[PDB]
Structures are given as structure tokens and as C-alpha cells.
Amino acid sequence: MASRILLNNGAKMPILGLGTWKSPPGQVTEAVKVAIDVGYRHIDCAHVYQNENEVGVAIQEKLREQVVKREELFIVSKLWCTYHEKGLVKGACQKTLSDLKLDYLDLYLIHWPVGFKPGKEFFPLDESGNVVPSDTNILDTWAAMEELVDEGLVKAIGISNFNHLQVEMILNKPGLKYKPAVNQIECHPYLTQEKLIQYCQSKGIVVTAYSPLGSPDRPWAKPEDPSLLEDPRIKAIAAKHNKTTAQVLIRFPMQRNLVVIPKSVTPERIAENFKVFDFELSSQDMTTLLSYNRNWRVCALLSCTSHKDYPF
């Protein structure tokens, strides 16, 4: 299949991108250079990942080398929770643009549907360990996102980790100017997301699947947790197709009309992970992978669960 999906802003988005959460700053410049050299045209970034400067060094060097043109890249970043205030959104976006060495983003996402108290700390806590909210709601934050489109800073805006009702809230916003182009959510065989995906796709919102390999490097991993990459049932599908388990896990969301953003800093795996456009999972394979759903989430956070807009 086709390498790009059409968004509701009229632009095309590469269905495979490189994730950068947890990519060490001393390794991510080379990772992104290698990715672009082996064909990646989409990089998923975020201010909270603390490595955008180093991602940007790689992007800028590949543009300077003329390995790629800017118009051929699709660079995504995300507005962190401590910048859900009207007066802070532009500067947050501009800091990300500065760090990435860009004059526009292809897509800018509200990272989570929760706002936190502004300040230096990414997770401001009260003395009992609860996150300190902002009173700013998702609709006012969305209006601020829309302004970025109208100022030329970003080509598309979207959302991430929004539940059904939250997506609906944006779609139903009085005076809505731009619909979200994308909802980026966790999705893999243990968290298949059929309901939310159906909803978003029915509204013309493209879904991006994060943690498609189950995030084995997530900092809170525990022994006992399920492991996609080690699941013998998934290994068996991979062996049948003469592919790796990771390759199956990447191809799976692609065949659901999703965008997918596996992370690696390992050159061989970066290349591996891109070699997914030359085989097809059967419908039976797809349904079998869907059957592994256990509603198991990589990405949840106890400190934020009492926020009014916590999504899960």
C-alpha cells in the first residue's frame, strides 16, 4: 500500500513515522539521520521529551545535505499540559519550532486533554502528589491551536489521548474553525481501540497509533506485564510471513488505516521497522491480532487521575 494518508486539511501524512520519546539526546540525532537516509519522512516529537533540539540538528542537516526537501518531511510535535493557556500556546509552539530548526510544523497536537498549572515543572504537584490543574478547558485550548494555523506556524492541528466524549466536545465546539486532523492514541494488539478508532474515522479524523510495540523501554515497566514482542502467538504470525515480530506489529495498524510511529535509536531496527510495505497480513491474521485485546495501557499516570479531564 500507499505510503501517505490524506488528512482533512488537504495535506498528505506518511503512515510510518519515527517515534522519539525516550530517545537519548546523545543518540537521537544519529537515529533521525539514519531514519531519513533509509526512507522515513515523518518524525513524531514533543517538547516534553526534552530532545527536540537534537532531533532538529538531524532534520536541519538532512535538509542542508539535500537528502530531502522540507515539503517532503512531515514533522509533528505536541503542546505540553503546562501550556494550556491562551497566552502561552504561541510561545510553546515557537520554542518547539526554534528547537526543531523549522519555520512550520506539519502537525501540532494537544498532547493530553488535561491542563496543568504553568511553570517550570512539567508535572506541578501539590504537597500530597496530585497534579495541580489549570482551569483552562479543552475548547479554549483548541481556539488557541486554531490561531496557530491562521498565523502560519502549523499546517494542521490535532489532539492526542482524547477519549470519545472529548473528541465529540471539540467537534461540537461552538464556532469551530478547524476540525482536528488527527487523534494520536495508544494502540496495539493488547489495546486495540476498536470503538474510539471507529468513531474518529467516521468523522474523518486520522488516528495515529503510539506505542505499537508495547513500549518495552517505558520507565515504569514491570516484570509481570505482558510483552507483545515476546508473545508466541504474534511470533508465529511473523514466522509465517518471514518477518520479525516488530514488523508484524507495525504492519497491523497500517492495515487498519492508521498511522504508526515506532520508536528506535538502534540503526538496524530503524531500517527493519521501515521494511513493512512489501507484505500483507490476511484478514484472518488481522482478526487474530485484534483478538489479543486486553485493555492494557502503557500510558497512564496515577498522579493525574483526579484531574477533571483525565481521559481514561
Ligand X SMILES: O=C(O)COc1cc(F)ccc1C(=S)NCc1ccc(Br)cc1F
Residues that bind ligand NAP (CB under 6 A): 19-22, 44, 111, 160-161, 184, 210-218, 229, 244, 246, 261-266, 269, 272-273, 298-299
The item of ligand NAP, ligand X, none sharing an interface with residue 300, based on CB under 5 to 8 Å by kind, is ligand X
Q: What residue is closest to ligand X based on CB? A: 301
CB 188 within 8 Å of CB 249 = yes
The reply to whether 230 sits in an annotated binding site is yes
Query: Which residues between 78 and 137 bind ligand X (CB under 6 A)?
Result: 81, 112, 114
Tell which residue, 111, 131, 68, 143, has the closest CA to residue 301: 131
User: 131: which DSSP letter?
Assistant: B
The item of ligand NAP, ligand X, none sharing an interface with residue 261, based on CB under 5 to 8 Å by kind, is ligand NAP
Query: Which residues between 16 and 75 bind ligand X (CB under 6 A)?
Result: 21, 46, 48-49
The item of ligand NAP, ligand X, none sharing an interface with residue 183, based on CB under 5 to 8 Å by kind, is none
Q: Name residue, grid cell 506518511.
A: 14
Type of residue numbered 175: G
The item of ligand NAP, ligand X, none sharing an interface with residue 262, based on CB under 5 to 8 Å by kind, is ligand NAP
Residues 204 and 208: their CA atoms lie apart, in Å, by: 13
* CB nearer to ligand X: pick between 114 and 276: 114
User: At closest approach, how far in Å is the CB of 133 from ligand NAP?
Assistant: 18
Number of helical (H) and strand (E) elements in the chain, helices listed first: 10, 10
Helix axes 25-38, 267-274, angle to 10 degrees: 40
Residues 285 and 295: their CA atoms lie apart, in Å, by: 19
* CB nearer to ligand X: pick between 1 and 300: 300
The reply to whether 35 sits in an annotated binding site is no
The reply to whether 253 sits in an annotated binding site is yes
The reply to whether 59 sits in an annotated binding site is no
Identify the active-site residue in 40, 49, 108, 210. Answer: 49
The item of ligand NAP, ligand X, none sharing an interface with residue 301, based on CB under 5 to 8 Å by kind, is ligand X
CB 83 within 8 Å of CB 141 = no
Type of residue numbered 125: L
Tell which residue, 95, 230, 103, 96, has the closest CA to residue 155: 103
SS3 of residue 191 by DSSP: strand
CB 283 within 8 Å of CB 255 = no
Residues 229 and 189: their CA atoms lie apart, in Å, by: 11
49 is catalytic: yes
- Between CA 167 and CA 178, with CA 173 as vertex, the angle to 5 degrees is 80
User: At closest approach, how far in Å is the CB of 290 from ligand NAP?
Assistant: 18
User: At closest approach, how far in Å is the CB of 234 from ligand NAP?
Assistant: 12
The item of ligand X, ligand NAP, none sharing an interface with residue 211, based on CB under 5 to 8 Å by kind, is ligand NAP
User: At closest approach, how far in Å is the CB of 205 from ligand NAP?
Assistant: 15
Contact call for residue 252 and ligand X (CB under 6 A): no
C-alpha grid cell, residue 75: 514533522
Q: What is the dihedral of CA 13, 17, 23, 28, to 10 degrees?
A: -80
User: At closest approach, how far in Å is the CB of 66 from ligand NAP?
Assistant: 26
The reply to whether 254 sits in an annotated binding site is yes
- Binding-site residue positions for NADP(+): 10-19, 211-273
- Binding-site residue positions for substrate: 111
Q: Which residues bind ligand X (CB under 6 A)?
A: 21, 46, 48-49, 81, 112, 114, 299-301, 304
